[PDB]
A paper describes a structure:
[name] belongs to the scavenger receptor cysteine rich (SRCR) family and is a type I membrane protein with a short cytoplasmic tail, a single transmembrane helix, and a large ectodomain consisting of nine class B SRCR domains. Here we report the cryo-electron microscopy structures of human [name] in its unliganded state and in its complex with HpHb. These structures reveal that [name] functions as a trimer, forming a composite binding site at its center for one protomer of the dimeric HpHb, resulting in a 3:1 binding stoichiometry. Widespread electrostatic interactions mediated by calcium ions are pivotal in both pre-ligand and ligand-bound receptor assemblies.
The cryo-EM map of the complex, obtained at a resolution of 3.3 Å, enabled us to construct an atomic model that clearly demonstrates [name] and the dimeric Hp(1–1)Hb bind with a 3:1 receptor-ligand stoichiometry. Here, D5–D9 from each [name] subunit join together to form an enclosed base near the membrane, stabilized by interdomain contacts between neighboring D7 and D9, while D1–D4 of each [name] extend upward to embrace the HpHb triad. This interaction positions the HpSP domain at the apex of the complex, with Hbαβ nestled below between D3 and D4 of each [name]. At the top of the interface, the HpSP domain contacts D2 of [name]-I. Here, the positively charged Lys262 from the edge of Hp forms electrostatic pairing with the negatively charged Ca+2-coordinated acidic cluster Asp186 and Glu252, while Arg252 nearby makes a salt bridge interaction with Glu216. Lastly, Hbβ engages with D3 of the remaining third chain, [name]-II, through electrostatic pairing of Lys83 with the Ca+2-coordianted acidic cluster Asp293 and Glu359 of [name]-II. The [name]–[name] interface at the bottom follows the same pattern of Ca+2-dependent electrostatic interactions that recur between D7 and D9 of adjacent subunits. Indeed, the three subunits in the [name]/Hp(1–1)Hb complex show a significant shift in their relative positions, primarily through concerted swing motions at the base.
Residue numbers in the entry:
A (entry chain E): 2 to 147
B (entry chain B): 187 to 475
C (entry chain F): 33 to 98, 103 to 346
D (entry chain D): 2 to 142
E (entry chain G): 33 to 88
F (entry chain C): 263 to 475
């Protein structure tokens, strides 16, 4: 529906090469230092003042594993994205009150992180499919908001 | 400062049951007499409001028209039921809220939630599915949405429900349940040369359907091939020797580890309640063909 | 009126109470007890013939509070903000001063128009969205007499808007809260970090800043002879004695385009009322510059009252 | 809000880009076109085919302007005065498209030059590109 | 009885007071100011449910 | 004082616009020009408005401040100075592009095909106010091409290419247009067609072969 079968193959292929342990910590650490208004939500994770502390903090790295796994879980079936993220969207809307833009910002940083880790293999058609995936996830986690 | 967990402690003091939510201004009745607690906030850990923290003791800041009132779930005329199924233990779930019967949204429905509903209704919970069978979409207000339950609870009202009357989900999808003893479930292969090769046909409570090809693969195919006693699975297609009939109900599979003994042990398999027009029927050819 | 129950050996004369609906405040000199008389028109002693009035409540939101980033407005803590959309869908904010009147900037009403365009051209096209989504039709668009020195414009609605929990005017202060260190809340309808107009109302606390380093950061110096345009965004803000500058927040948040007309609301904790201390005028700083320019409400308080009277 | 330590990284990182700046700008332009199809509406007559000479030519001039801005980091609005008027007063390019180009340019730099993109440099180069976009769009109406 | 004049965005709490009949004096200790309630029965705080009565 | 005059044109009813305001003369930037605006301009000039075109006839760019930019007129106006203009005396256009005004009585416009074996097929050529001209093929397509064939009465249009027979003289002033519905009968019925003021190095003279060849 959303993606062509050739587009789906490449997206699923690259997601195999990823190192879930380190990619999640990388993207979360970058967002907390590039856009430094998300440090407010992660005050439970300790010191986050300096970029090296943000990268070296164990808690954000562990939270990166949770973020990455949920992204992989969302990739399981695209039409279910409304129902897949309905449980998580409520947490981000009623308890933490995370603005929908931060979902779009984290996804954009994820594309940059994946491009940094891979290199030339981040073919422009490949990133186009990834952006379409990211846009849906940001919309799906925000569609709960009303 | 009235809270939902604050209301939970309140209805526990009456010992009747859980409350649907916290309500303000006492819309049902007018207050009377002096009041002792104002702007009351409670964490919910405390057994009673008396152990709960009070902003003021022996006084009230809200007037009798603004003072809160409590509406309780057990006091509300709530009763779960099943409508339009193959038997009395299958079909679309219904919740009577405020005297109006409504369905349950599909989003958030899990095998744990199906286990609770089967226990609540009264027929055995040996095998529980998360889909509605042979039923059509209902009309009314969807009173429950994103019902997330641990499974070991007496009723779904005590389970954490998002909100009464959210109705966010479309009325086409409604949560259903299939409470089965485990004897009626049967799986067979039809339309091929041998019993081990053909189209996967399921028969649950004497209702014949197929298996959708959403996540069907070789790994999920070993479960079926082993279950029929026909070795492992080689090919997802087969050679047609006869024409199978046409069925309207479909079984949907989430995921399987591949080491399961039977297809029924795979986690979160939905029976009916959905259509996959783009996808085709799932087929399989066992090695013992 | 309902018939009173019959009593033995008594003739009844009536005296009823008058109370204003919640979210409104009664305005009358007397208690409001209205006594029925032979002429059959109910009269209170102090109020006489005139009926008591129910006016809006100032700056008392149901849910008190605690753009690039900011905090999502989920509890509806800013019921005086009002979106304004121009011809090309260039949305902009606008605050709510009186029950019928709104406050914005002059440059908000010059979009797609000439710098000397009359009020008659602007009026038919401004689309206000006060409240959740309640569209409102306007009648008059008054500009300031000096639109080149104070970017302020008043808007008159056709009829008064009901004061619900999501619609509430914020009235003007009696003194000046523009003292360095006064942290104030700014609500915005403009661009976010991706420069797309926000679909949800956001807000951020910004502290007032010394108005010497703000001018030196923009106009080069406080001496008129040595002033040179060195605004790091390429557009010179309109700076004079009717302005104050507010820097970024702790987490490096500021206001980008489309946030003009918003209110620099401060919380008077002693009176628990929200007062408008400034109106955002130069919102083009975003994250490049370090100061946003706000038009002081007190300097225009005298002029606003005169226009409202007419 | 580029601090003096932030501008040092920007000049050093852009210096390591070297002569490949023109190709990097061209790749970012092509990358944004196919990823965000609505952007092509702003280029009416340009040939949008992959590897087009005009796209390569446009990328060279875009990277030329950015390299000029780095040398004039202290005074950006004057160094980008002509481009600000053309991009806002003539073509009326929506400011939302600028954040798309900046993201695509950063991705191109990150993919082609991964070793030098430490998180400290990533923030500094991001703040530099945000400063350029605001200057160009500051007179949009 | 005639309706009280209406006020914009305001509610009127109706109330009627009983004046004692001529040649009689109010036996009840209450003055007799009855106020309309949601239950349609007018009540004075002092007299309560019992209706006022005047004696010679 | 306001006075708009045509200069460097074939006649007094067609030429490059020149507007005086405050006492200083200047030219209008071509951006925002529309056929209706030119119709309003012809009313100021007094020339007949049976056929009106936005093109500029063989006129130079000149030298002067661009007083009016992005003028938007719809036709039912007394003069173009009444229509809203982007700023006064402020411009950001290139100095070469000047707003052109062409007013036609309706009889001067002629359409002919030359270079082919028959009159129905050949390179498209346009003669307006005894000025020879060709058609650039930017918008050129088969459905608008049927109008040229239909105007000449030579049936439908089959293909753009035509078999050369004799050579054709080269001209400088060039005509081009956006598109045509095809429902019409004359090329002048196509709206917003420019007559001169620009050149086509990317694009060449339009040709046709009609069915009646
Ligand atoms: C964009 C896709 C995102 C996904 C898939 C995601 C996923 C998750 C998940 C699964 C959790 C649950 C962790 C737990 O329960 O222990 C979580 C927690 C959390 N997330 Fe997200 N997240 C996303 C974006 C964000 C962003 C951009 C922020 C910015 C601050 C954020 C803030 C938080 C916070 C504060 C928590 C902690 C919740 C708690 O402590 O109760 N999330 N996230
Ligand atoms: C950092 C961001 C940008 C820079 C440094 C930049 C720079 C330039 C440069 C150097 C030119 C050449 C002008 C000339 O040769 O006369 C140009 C033209 C142009 N710009 Fe950009 N640009 C940026 C962003 C954008 C974006 C995002 C768009 C559209 C979405 C855009 C739209 C255009 C167009 C359409 C032209 C063609 C003008 C022509 O062909 O005459 N610009 N820009
Ligand atoms: C469910 O099946 C029963 C028979 O088992 C049938 O009577 C009923 O109509 C079915 N429900 C539908 C088709 O909605
Ligand atoms: C089947 O494999 C899964 C992992 O894929 C494992 O969790 C589970 O315990 C296994 N079951 C058996 C019976 O070996
Ligand atoms: C344009 O043509 C007319 C008519 O032949 C002529 O008078 C005028 O000089 C020409 N202008 C130029 C610049 O060739
Ligand atoms: C223009 O063509 C349309 C169909 O596209 C037709 O309805 C209309 O009558 C035509 N106008 C004319 C021939 O003037
Ligand atoms: Ca669903
Ligand atoms: Ca659940
Ligand atoms: Ca032009
Ligand atoms: Ca026009």
């Amino acid at each position: 529906v959303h993606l062509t079968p050739e587009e789906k193959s490449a997206v699923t292929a690259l997601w195999g090469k990823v190192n879930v342990d380190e990619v999640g910590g990388e993207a979360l650490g970058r967002l907390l230092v590039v856009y430094p208004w998300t440090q407010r939500f992660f005050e439970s994770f300790g010191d986050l003042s300096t970029p090296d502390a943000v990268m070296g903090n164990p808690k954000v790295k562990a939270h990166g594993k949770k973020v990455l796994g949920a992204f992989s879980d969302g990739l399981a079936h695209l039409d279910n994205l409304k129902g897949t993220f309905a449980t998580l969207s409520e947490l981000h809307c009623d308890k933490l009150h995370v603005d929908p833009e931060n979902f779009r910002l984290l996804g954009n940083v994820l594309v940059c992180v994946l491009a940094h880790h891979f290199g030339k293999e981040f073919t422009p058609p490949v990133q186009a499919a990834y952006q379409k995936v990211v846009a849906g996830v940001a919309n799906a986690l925000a569609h709960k908001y009303h | 400062n009235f809270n939902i967990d604050h209301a939970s402690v309140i209805c526990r003091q009456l010992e009747c049951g859980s409350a649907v939510s916290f309500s303000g201004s006492s819309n049902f009745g007018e207050g009377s007499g002096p009041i002792w607690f104002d702007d009351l906030i409670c964490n919910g850990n405390e057994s009673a409001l008396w152990n709960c923290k009070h902003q003021g003791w022996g006084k009230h800041n809200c007037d009798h028209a603004e003072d809160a009132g409590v509406i309780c779930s057990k006091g509300a005329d709530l009763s779960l039921r099943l409508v339009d199924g193959v038997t009395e233990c299958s079909g679309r779930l219904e919740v009577r809220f405020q005297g109006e019967w409504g369905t349950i949204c599909d989003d958030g429905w899990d095998s744990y939630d199906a286990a609770v509903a089967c226990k609540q209704l009264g027929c055995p919970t040996a095998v529980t599915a998360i889909g509605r069978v042979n039923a059509s979409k209902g009309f009314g207000h969807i009173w429950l949405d994103s019902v997330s339950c641990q499974g070991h609870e007496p009723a779904i009202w005590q389970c954490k429900h998002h909100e009464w009357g959210k109705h966010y989900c479309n009325h086409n999808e409604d949560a259903g349940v299939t409470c089965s003893d485990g004897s009626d479930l049967e799986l067979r292969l039809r339309g091929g040369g041998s019993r081990c090769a053909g189209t996967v046909e399921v028969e649950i409570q004497r209702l014949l359907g197929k298996v959708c090809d959403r996540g069907w693969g070789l790994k999920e195919a070993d479960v079926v091939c082993r279950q029929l006693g026909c070795g492992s699975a080689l090919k997802t297609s087969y050679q047609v020797y006869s024409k199978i009939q046409a069925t309207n109900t479909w079984l949907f599979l989430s995921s399987c580890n591949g080491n399961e003994t039977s297809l029924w042990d795979c986690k979160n398999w939905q029976w009916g309640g959905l259509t996959c027009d783009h996808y085709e029927e799932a087929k399989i050819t066992c090695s013992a063909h | 009126c309902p018939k009173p129950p019959e009593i033995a050996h008594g003739y009844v004369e009536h005296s009823v109470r008058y109370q204003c609906k919640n979210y409104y405040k009664l305005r009358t000199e007397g208690d409001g007890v209205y006594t029925l008389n032979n002429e059959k028109q109910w009269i209170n002693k102090a109020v006489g013939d005139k009926l008591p009035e129910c006016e809006a409540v100032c700056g008392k939101p149901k849910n008190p509070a605690n753009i690039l980033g900011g905090h999502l407005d989920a509890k509806g803590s800013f019921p005086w903000q009002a979106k304004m959309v121009s011809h090309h869908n260039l949305t902009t904010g606008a605050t709510l001063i009186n029950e019928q009147w709104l406050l914005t900037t002059a440059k908000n009403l010059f979009l797609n128009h000439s710098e000397n365009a009359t009020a008659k051209d602007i009026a038919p096209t401004l689309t206000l969205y006060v409240g959740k989504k309640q569209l409102v039709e306007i009648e008059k668009v008054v500009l300031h007499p000096n639109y080149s020195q104070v970017d302020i414009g008043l808007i008159k609605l056709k009829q008064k808007v009901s004061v619900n929990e999501r619609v509430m005017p914020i009235c003007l202060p009696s003194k000046d809260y523009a003292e360095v260190g006064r942290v104030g809340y700014v609500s915005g309808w403009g661009r976010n970090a991706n420069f797309k107009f926000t679909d949800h109302l956001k807000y951020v606390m910004l502290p007032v800043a010394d108005q010497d380093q703000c001018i030196r950061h923009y106009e080069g110096s406080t001496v008129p002879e040595k002033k040179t345009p060195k605004s790091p965004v390429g557009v010179q803000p309109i700076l004079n004695e009717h302005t104050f500058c507010a820097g970024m927040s702790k987490y490096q948040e500021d206001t980008c385009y489309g946030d003009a007309g918003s209110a620099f609301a401060v919380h008077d904790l002693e009176e628990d009322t929200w007062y408008a201390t400034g109106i955002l005028s130069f919102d083009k700083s975003c994250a490049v510059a370090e100061y946003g320019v706000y038009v002081k409400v007190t300097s225009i308080q005298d002029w606003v009252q005169k226009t409202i009277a007419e | 809000v580029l601090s003096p330590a932030d501008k040092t990284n920007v000049k050093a990182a852009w210096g390591k880009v070297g002569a490949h700046a023109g190709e990097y700008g061209a790749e970012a332009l092509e990358r944004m076109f196919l990823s965000f199809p609505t952007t092509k509406t702003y280029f009416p007559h340009f040939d949008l085919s992959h590897g087009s000479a005009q796209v390569k030519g446009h990328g060279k001039k875009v990277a030329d302007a950015l390299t000029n801005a780095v040398a004039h980091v202290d005074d950006m609005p004057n160094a980008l005065s002509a481009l600000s008027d053309l991009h806002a007063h003539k073509l009326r390019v929506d400011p939302v498209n600028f954040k798309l180009l900046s993201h695509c340019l950063l991705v191109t730099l990150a993919a082609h030059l991964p070793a030098e993109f430490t998180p400290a440099v990533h923030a500094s180069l991001d703040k530099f590109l945000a400063s350029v976009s605001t200057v160009l769009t500051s007179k949009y109406r």
